[PDB]
Amino acid sequence: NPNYSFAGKTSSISDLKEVPRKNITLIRGLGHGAFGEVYEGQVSSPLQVAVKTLPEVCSEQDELDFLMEALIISKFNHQNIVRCIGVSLQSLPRFILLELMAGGDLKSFLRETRPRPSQPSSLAMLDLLHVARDIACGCQYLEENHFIHRDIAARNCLLTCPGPGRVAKIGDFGMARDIYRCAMLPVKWMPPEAFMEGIFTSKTDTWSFGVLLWEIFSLGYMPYPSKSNQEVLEFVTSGGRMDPPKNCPGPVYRIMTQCWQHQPEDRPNFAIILERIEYCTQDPDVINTALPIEYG
Numbered sequence: 001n002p003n004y005s006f007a008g009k010t011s012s013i014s015d016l017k018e019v020p021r022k023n024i025t026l027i028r029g030l031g032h033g034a035f036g037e038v039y040e041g042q043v044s045s046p047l048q049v050a051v052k053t054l055p056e057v058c059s060e061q062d063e064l065d066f067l068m069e070a071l072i073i074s075k076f077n078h079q080n081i082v083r084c085i086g087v088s089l090q091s092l093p094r095f096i097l098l099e100l101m102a103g104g105d106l107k108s109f110l111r112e113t114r115p116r117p118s119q120p121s122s123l124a125m126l127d128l129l130h131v132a133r134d135i136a137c138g139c140q141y142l143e144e145n146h147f148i149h150r151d152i153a154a155r156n157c158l159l160t161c162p163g164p165g166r167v168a169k170i171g172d173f174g175m176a177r178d179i180y181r182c183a184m185l186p187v188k189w190m191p192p193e194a195f196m197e198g199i200f201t202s203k204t205d206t207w208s209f210g211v212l213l214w215e216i217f218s219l220g221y222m223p224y225p226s227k228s229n230q231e232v233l234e235f236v237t238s239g240g241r242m243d244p245p246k247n248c249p250g251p252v253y254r255i256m257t258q259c260w261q262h263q264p265e266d267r268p269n270f271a272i273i274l275e276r277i278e279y280c281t282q283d284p285d286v287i288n289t290a291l292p293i294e295y296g
């Protein structure tokens with residue numbers, strides 16, 4: 001019966017909104033994340049949801065991890081963090097019910113929606129700046145509430161829909177969950193002090209957000225092209241930084257390099273990041289820059 005605290009308030013399993021199992025219907029598989037499969041579902045004009053499932057074959061620790069994940073997501077309240085409709089923990093397999101994000105994960109979206117001869121203007125700079133603003137807004141909410149994400153990366157962000165008017169949200173809190181209670185650490189998203197001293201602060205998430213910005217403006221490339229985890233660790237620790245993505249406007253790259261200052265005190269907080277993203281968004285020289293066309 002672990003307690004969870006956020007924003008000075010303590011909650012437990014009894015605070016989660018249990019939805020009767022008979023009201024929940026699975027429609028289709030949407031793929032898998034940290035735990036088992038995620039399904040499209042509906043709760044009884046039914047409510048459309050994403051259903052995160054816990055494998056019935058799992059450890060005591062897997063169970064406790066799943067519970068902590070439920071508590072974490074249920075206590076956030078922000079438009080750029082996926083909502084939790086509720087849980088179904090009293091039937092097996094256990095479910096967490098979340099806001100359905102019909103556009104899928106941000107990394108996949110960027111790779112699949114790259115401008116190409118068949119879809120020549122599938123995305124523009126403003127689409128990318130809007131995604132960046134959306135995630136920066138969610139990050140600012142976390143920072144204001146003293147929550148350190150620890151894995152701000154494109155794979156962990158989701159889109160409401162594929163089309164125009166999409167909203168990007170933070171959708172996975174697995175790293176924070178593990179720490180609340182190595183070839184799997186997200187080395188390529190971590191600042192020098194994090195992988196050395198294990199020191200984490202909100203300026204950790206600033207650094208990671210810089211890497212996310214690179215992922216966005218590269219249209220979904222893996223950070224540090226051609227470098228392994230240890231090569232990145234040594235590169236970053238020695239002052240090495242990524243080059244601008246193809247066609248990236250200068251003002252946008254400058255946000256990245258500010259996010260990647262060696263000393264955490266020299267990195268901007270998220271209020272400043274949002275200010276800078278807004279300035280880029282209003283600058284015609286930025287938003288009129290054409291994205292590269294991937295040949296196809």
Ligand SMILES: COC(=O)[C@H]1CC[C@@H](n2c(NC(=O)c3ccccc3)nc3ccc(CN4CCCCC4)cc32)CC1
Pocket residue numbers: 029030031032033034038050082098099100101102103104105155156158171172
């Ligand atoms: C956090 O990311 C995940 O959990 C992964 C990636 C996103 C996945 N996903 C999700 N995930 C969610 O909506 C979601 C995930 C976590 C929290 C809240 C919502 N929605 C998707 C919509 C479409 C598609 C693409 N579609 C899959 C079926 C066959 C054809 C291609 C994938 C969607 C779930 C699994």
